[PDB]
Design a protein around this nucleic acid. Structure first.
Ligand SMILES: Nc1ccn([C@H]2C[C@H](O)[C@@H](COP(=O)(O)OP(=O)(O)OP(=O)(O)O)O2)c(=O)n1
Ligand SMILES: [Ca+2]
Lengths: 932, 353, 352
DNA sequence: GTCGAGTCTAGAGGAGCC
DNA sequence: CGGGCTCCTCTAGACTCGAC
């Protein structure tokens, strides 16, 4: 039979797969290790628990290349990244002639030979380049000019929109409006993701062999800094040994750190961020010179960085994954514009509804100026109520005509007394001080009558609404944030955040509003999401009463995300592919809309923007999922596959939990399930809802995402006060004593997680900390020889986070190999920190799902292999479910019903629900083979 | 009953408390509105016409007769749908048989109450292909609800409901939360081709519109709203006793007064300002022609109860420095502004409201 | 004859080619008005309101019902005078019992022929008997000037003085149609018979202040037919062309496209269309047409539709912004920048 | 030649993702 | 000792600059 077990009774991988992955034969765990494991599990009461075996899986995996799994992965990575390595070496040993004396003024690509000779060329025609693109921000998103460095000659590109001046261009971008480039080619840049988005051939649905390398990603890999470290570095520039070998991701700072020559020059006028097209056409030579200087600095930094990156990240899988993570593709259609319009319209309507009440309250409050009645209002007594003087230096036809003319002339004569008034108009002198601020001035192009510059986040809105906390008026203190005043000082029966005597308001005591993050933090707005339970409970009461306060908080929650994300989402660069640029499969598909527009969005991803080498993207890695209350939260659902294509992806189940558990198990006795924590991690299925996150969400009635936050905080150093604050925040039914009691029980430890902590501390305190799987070193600004004992939490979390990044790299390499080998027509779509989406054709969706399952199996086996273990439990061998959907969303079953899209995706956009498939269904549908 | 007392006193409504009960107002058997009520209803109709017809390349005005002749005595119309449906074939030629296109009309419909009640209704017969009929119905529901909410102090008092007809046809209804209860103000019905086929028996070739490259018989979408109940709802929403009507709906925009002597020259200044504001499209209340002198506070209260946006005051000092006094209803604050910059400020205030 | 065919084709008048006739149009029994005719009538009503009610402090709007209940078994209204007379006492409070004051309303009046609906513009003028004839002559002159203001041939808008059976002086305004002279407006000096009849006894309520003395006013009835005025202007405005006055013409600017590409030209035309709409200019969206016909045919179609100017957007607009601009009156073409079109149209309408 | 209104910037607090 | 990111709005402070 295919069933297998271990000394600790944990079900292991099926023999038909174990013989293919780990081979036959190996080293036995021994006897003392098993005795220690049995004693540990018996002390923790886990040895006697039985588990129902999972169905066995029999597959014919693709033929592995090397003698074992590590050699297989190394061969795959080397075959994937070989041409790009030689291109990088060509750039490394390049001989660059000096830049031409005069930059060319022509449309297209110009090649500058020796002595400044400019030649018109169609494409650069080079295997390796250093690239930088300049875009006139005022005009839009179309590129303006670009400078390309080659080992043989210089290159410069100028847009038609820069050379030619027209009344109006097309606001909808097209491939014919992008930079022409493009058997493997390498492009190197400081933010090459930004420069990738301006290449003509990077938006075709079918893939290409051009890859991109980044210098700030390599800077983060080699000698990067954390955000707190970035702030400290900036403060110090204006234990500290790490300052010398670290810098921020600015090109000037990176050049100073790695080259250290003359400081890089920056154009002070900023003619692309603050200027216009005429300024660029006037300062063409200077801007092109600055672009060339940036390209030269990037080339020098790349030369100084590549050997260091290869030394500190020697595994080819890291480079292959970074190359694959650079390419990202998000297809869209005409529904993207409709989503933008609907989200903006809903946001405007809700903003107007919010502003109407505040404007009415402000207008009604102006009547307190008459008679000095403001000095008795508990909310508006301390505002600015001053006034400003106005500074200063029948009838006949003939009779009616004459009367009208005389009246008009008298009116015209009066209008001519403008000489005595001051030139600069005064801004509402008659209104009180606090009312002028809320009103836009007449010269503002966005002027609106009334106090239109008013919002909940302002410091006067709580005073206008007369918010009250437990029968006491709200009061703002600059030192202590928002609070409330308890009358009766009579120079305290109420107990709260504390009787702060610093404020010293006569006849009252100042008590701070409770904050979700402790007494140290200060509340900046009583309209935050945390006070909605207090609004419903009646502790926080608005002056008008009724539902005005709760409605205010509800609308604030509805428009909070879009308020902070509308500029990012609306500014996304979308290039619409014409009919000739579309595959014939899309054209011939029934779903193809003839009048529709099909395009693509390329995320501007920094491959290694984290000290843990995680990717960072301003919009798509911060994109919220669809929710019933958030406006514009169906953002990711607008990434719709073209007619004839599907999005196949999966999410790794308990990634960091399993990585920490397997590290602890390998450190303890060399078997899966050796530790109590590792045994608990393995004993659980997501479909049955018995995993660690669900178990915690059942033990304490918080949501499963709240359980994720709780567990991950507890792992990485959160104390008991943090745990009890989280419990009180997420489960409002609890009290302080109940949260304190639940804190001890969930933190009851010679402990369940002792081995994991010991292993993580040992790896963190090593002279050169490295990833246990791929051997990637830590940043030079975090080694113990550079930081000593500081940043301990960051260092202990780095091991697991960089292990997850290695997991992502291995998944990308395996998926690329499987797609290339068996002719699976598809390409990598986007990878969130633990998700991997692939744009595959409709005909090959199940083959793609099988490839994903095989990739997950291989990655888990590699993780087990590198730590000393020679087997893999069947529970973690495959994805719980693989999504096959036409759009991108957290779950295939959900319909994105939001305030912007209340009818749902099926009704408004005609997107049917997808399917989530386990390994067995994929095997049944594919007959177990990846062939066609 | 304070609002109705103000409306009678400020000539929004005609009659007495006997003819102006809630049932009489909601039924259409009341006497006609006052001049201020007529102006408010005209502003509401103008806003509706702008939003529904002006910024639409396919919505055209239609003229439906007040009576339906023949089968022998005729009858007074009870809905505007029939007359607009009678013009579908003729109006197809305007859009060259392209769909969707709509016919809009504002008129008086006679509803039996036997007493005959007159209601001013605004119609929009929206011919659409059957493929996107539900999407168009939802779009028009959202559009009309936003239109009703954007002139309201409390938009939450305007709500919507989903309803089905006797034949199961989908539709929607709009309501305003009056102090006594919610009353219907607008009704959208997603009719099919039943009325079109019944009104044009025979070949359906004449009824074929173009959905892209496909000929199809359209599904009739009818939107019918109550302008009288709409303005009554806005009067209740607006209601120191002040009717805070929207600047785009207030019947009279500016009240123009005068201070002390000299009388003769200030009358000329006021008349010139009156003519200027009239030629610029601003409705003015000539308070300078009233011989019955009243205190400034009483005049302010009277203007506030009349939904007067601004009270322009021309005094003796205006002749020597050109400054005029402007009190706003919203804030009750007095501002001194130059006379040359009054018209532009008022136009900006009205347009940007 | 040909003018009626043009109005039927260009959607000035609704109905079939046989359902419309001269007698039906004059009587009010025609099937109705097309969208262009509706807009022309709306422009006429707006001009009448501006000339009568807007620029006078004594004239107020009235709200008269279409039906008069009670014993006279209700009946549809035949005149707009009775509602104003019923509102006389209450509307006398707004002016603080000052005289003169007026009440004006535009509405549909029903006359037996069948039922003939005519939209009539009415003004009632409450004056003391001392200045009745002076105000009657004043209103006669003003109304004749208003009718002649929009006419290419104001000689056809005649006038006449007539005496009724009772013996009350009144005037009648006429238009010279190609078949004869048809009444378009009539003024009367009714006196105080109706006001006393509808308010029997207690004449103290009907008193009005003629300065120092309280006077029972004399009512002046100014009644004109806007539909008949619309027909008169259509006949006056008529190479087949309908040279309607710019303040009355239903559609002012025609916006078209000349060549490819479709998307950019469509966007430019949509922006110009939105701007012209926001600036109160009526535009005919002719750029939506799937198959553009000959430019001569479009010009003829827009001439028959009383459109002031035609704007043609081509590739040159994208490059230089210059747009073709044809004038309906002078049939002359010119090219002007697209940023100055709105101001040009506004100034042209103001000058008209 | 003084001074009160634009303009830029740094900091605090809040809010999306993994 | 949760960690790693990302961006935003609002407010106070310093600097600048045109007009009286
Ligand atoms: N508050 C958080 C959220 C996430 N992560 C890290 C740990 C996870 O391994 C990784 C992926 O996040 P998920 O939300 O996907 O967590 P899981 O993969 O454990 O959940 P699931 O099993 O639902 O995928 O991100 C973290 O450290 N702290
Ligand atoms: Ca996960």
């Amino acid at each position: 039979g295919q069933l297998r077990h271990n000394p600790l009774d944990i079900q292991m991988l099926s023999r038909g797969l174990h013989e293919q992955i780990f081979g036959q034969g190996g080293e036995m765990p021994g006897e003392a290790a098993v005795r220690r494991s049995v004693e540990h599990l018996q002390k923790h009461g886990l040895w006697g628990q039985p588990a129902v075996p999972l169905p066995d899986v029999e597959l014919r995996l693709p033929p592995l290349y090397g003698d074992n799994l590590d050699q297989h992965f190394r061969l795959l990575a080397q075959k994937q990244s070989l041409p790009y390595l030689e291109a990088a070496n060509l750039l490394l040993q390049a001989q660059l002639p000096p830049k031409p004396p005069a930059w060319a003024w022509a449309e297209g690509w110009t090649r500058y030979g020796p002595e400044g000779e400019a030649v018109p060329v169609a494409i650069p025609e080079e295997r390796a380049l250093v690239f930088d693109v300049e875009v006139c921000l005022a005009e839009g998103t179309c590129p303006t000019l670009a400078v390309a460095i080659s080992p043989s000659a210089w290159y410069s590109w100028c847009s038609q929109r820069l050379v030619e001046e027209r009344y109006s261009w097309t606001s909808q971008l097209s491939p014919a409006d992008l930079i022409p480039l493009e058997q493997e080619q390498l492009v190197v840049g400081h933010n090459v993701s930004f420069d990738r988005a301006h290449i003509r051939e990077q938006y075709l649905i079918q893939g290409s062999r051009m890859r991109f390398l980044d210098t700030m990603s390599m800077h983060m890999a080699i000698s990067g800094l954390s955000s707190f470290q970035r702030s400290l570095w900036i403060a110090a520039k204006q234990s500290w040994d790490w300052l010398d070998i670290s810098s921020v991701n600015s090109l000037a700072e990176v050049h100073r750190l790695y080259v250290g020559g003359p400081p890089l020059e920056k154009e002070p006028r900023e003619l692309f961020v603050k200027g216009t097209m005429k300024d660029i056409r006037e300062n063409f030579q200077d801007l092109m010179q600055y672009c060339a200087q940036d390209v030269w600095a990037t080339h020098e930094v790349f030369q100084q960085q590549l050997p260091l990156f290869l030394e500190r990240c020697p595994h080819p899988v890291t480079l292959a994954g970074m190359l694959e993570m650079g390419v990202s593709y998000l297809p869209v259609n005409q529904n993207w514009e409709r989503y933008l319009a609907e989200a903006q319209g809903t946001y405007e309507e809700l903003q107007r509804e919010m502003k109407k009440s505040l404007m009415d309250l402000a207008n009604d409050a102006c009547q307190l100026l008459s008679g000095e009645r403001y000095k008795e209002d508990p909310w508006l007594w301390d505002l600015e109520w001053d006034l400003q003087e106005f500074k200063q230096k029948p009838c006949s036809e003939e009779e009616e005509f004459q009367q009208d003319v005389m009246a008009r002339a008298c009116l015209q004569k009066l209008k001519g007394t403008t000489e005595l008034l001051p030139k600069r108009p005064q801004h509402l002198p008659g209104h009180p001080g606090w009312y002028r601020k809320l009103c836009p001035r007449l010269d503002d192009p966005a002027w609106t009558p009334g106090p239109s510059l008013l919002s909940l986040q302002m410091r006067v809105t709580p005073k206008l609404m007369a918010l009250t906390w437990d029968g006491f008026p709200l009061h703002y203190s600059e030192r202590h944030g928002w609070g409330y005043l308890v009358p009766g000082r009579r120079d305290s029966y109420h107990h709260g955040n504390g009787p702060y005597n610093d404020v010293d308001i006569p006849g009252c005591w100042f008590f701070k509003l409770p904050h979700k993050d402790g007494n140290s933090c200060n509340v900046g707005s009583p309209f935050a999401k945390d006070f909605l339970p207090k609004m419903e409970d009646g502790t926080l009461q608005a002056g008008p009463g009724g539902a005005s306060g709760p409605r205010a908080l509800e609308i604030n929650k509805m428009i909070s995300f879009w308020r902070n994300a509308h500029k990012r989402i609306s500014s996304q660069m979308v290039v619409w592919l014409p009919r000739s640029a579309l595959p014939r499969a899309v054209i011939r598909h029934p779903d193809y809309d003839e009048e529709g527009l099909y395009g693509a969005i390329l995320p501007q991803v920094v491959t290694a923007g984290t000290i843990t080498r995680r990717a960072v993207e301003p919009t798509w890695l911060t994109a919220s999922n669809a929710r019933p209350d958030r406006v514009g939260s169906e953002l990711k659902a607008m990434v719709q596959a073209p007619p004839g294509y599907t999005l196949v992806g999966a999410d790794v189940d308990s990634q960091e939990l399993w990585i920490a558990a397997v590290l602890g198990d390998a450190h303890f006795a060399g078997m899966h399930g050796c530790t109590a924590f590792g045994w608990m991690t393995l004993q659980g299925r997501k479909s049955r809802g018995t995993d660690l996150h669900s178990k915690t969400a059942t033990t304490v009635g918080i949501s499963r995402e709240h359980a994720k936050i709780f567990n991950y905080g507890r792992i990485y150093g959160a104390g008991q006060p943090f745990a009890e604050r989280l419990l009180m925040q997420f489960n409002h039914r609890l009290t302080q004593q109940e949260a304190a009691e639940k804190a001890q029980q969930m933190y009851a430890a010679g402990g369940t997680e002792s081995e994991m902590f010991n292993k993580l501390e040992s790896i963190a305190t090593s002279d050169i900390p490295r990833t246990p799987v791929l051997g990637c070193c830590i940043s030079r600004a975090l080694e113990p020889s550079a930081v000593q004992e500081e940043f301990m939490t960051s260092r202990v979390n780095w091991v697991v986070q960089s292990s997850a990044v290695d997991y992502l790299h291995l998944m990308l390499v395996a998926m690329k190999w499987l797609f290339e080998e068996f002719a699976i027509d598809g390409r990598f779509c986007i990878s969130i920190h633990d998700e991997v989406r692939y744009l595959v054709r409709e005909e090959d969706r199940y083959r793609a799902a099988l490839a994903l399952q095989i990739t997950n199996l291989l990655t888990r086996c590699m993780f087990a292999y590198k730590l000393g273990l020679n087997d893999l439990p069947q529970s973690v061998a495959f994805f719980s479910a693989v999504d096959i959907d036409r759009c991108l969303r957290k779950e295939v079953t959900m319909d994105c019903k939001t305030p912007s899209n209340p009818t749902g995706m099926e009704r408004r956009y005609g997107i049917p629900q997808g399917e989530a498939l386990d390994i067995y269904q994929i095997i049944e549908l594919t007959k177990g083979s990846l062939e066609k | 009953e304070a609002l109705l007392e103000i409306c009678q006193r400020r000539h929004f409504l005609s009659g007495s408390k006997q003819q102006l009960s809630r049932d009489s107002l909601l039924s259409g058997c009341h006497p006609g509105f006052g001049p201020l009520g007529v102006e408010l209803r005209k502003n509401l109709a103008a806003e509706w016409w702008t939003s529904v017809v002006v910024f639409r390349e396919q919505v055209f005005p239609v003229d439906a007769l007040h009576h339906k002749p023949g089968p022998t005595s005729g009858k007074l119309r009870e809905n505007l749908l029939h007359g607009a449906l009678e013009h579908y074939v003729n109006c197809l030629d305007l859009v060259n048989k392209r769909l969707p296109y709509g016919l809009a009309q504002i008129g008086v419909c006679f509803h039996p109450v036997k007493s005959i009640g007159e209601k001013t209704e605004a119609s929009l017969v929206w011919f659409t292909p059957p493929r996107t009929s539900n999407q168009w119905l939802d779009f028009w529901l959202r559009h009309r609800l936003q239109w009703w909410r954007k002139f309201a102090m409390s938009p939450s008092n305007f709500s919507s409901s989903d309803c089905q007809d006797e034949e199961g046809r989908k539709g929607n209804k709009l309501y305003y939360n009056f102090p006594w209860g919610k009353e219907l103000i607008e009704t959208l019905w997603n009719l099919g081709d039943h009325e079109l086929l019944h009104m044009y028996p025979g070949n359906v070739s004449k009824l074929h519109g173009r959905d892209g490259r496909k000929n199809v018989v359209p599904c009739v979408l009818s939107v019918n709203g109550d302008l009288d109940r709409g303005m009554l709802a806005y009067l209740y929403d607006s209601f120191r006793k002040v009717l805070k009507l929207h600047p785009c709906l207030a019947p009279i925009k500016v009240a123009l007064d005068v201070g002390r002597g000299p009388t003769l020259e200030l009358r000329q200044v006021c008349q010139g300002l009156f003519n200027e504001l009239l030629e610029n499209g601003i409705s003015v209340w000539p308070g300078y022609l009233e011989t019955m002198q009243s205190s400034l506070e009483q005049l302010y209260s009277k203007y506030d109860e009349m939904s007067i946006l601004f009270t322009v005051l021309v005094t003796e000092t205006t002749l020597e420095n050109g400054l005029i006094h402007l009190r706003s209803r919203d804030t009750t604050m007095k501002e001194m502004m130059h006379i040359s910059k009054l018209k532009d400020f008022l136009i900006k205030y009205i347009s940007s409201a």
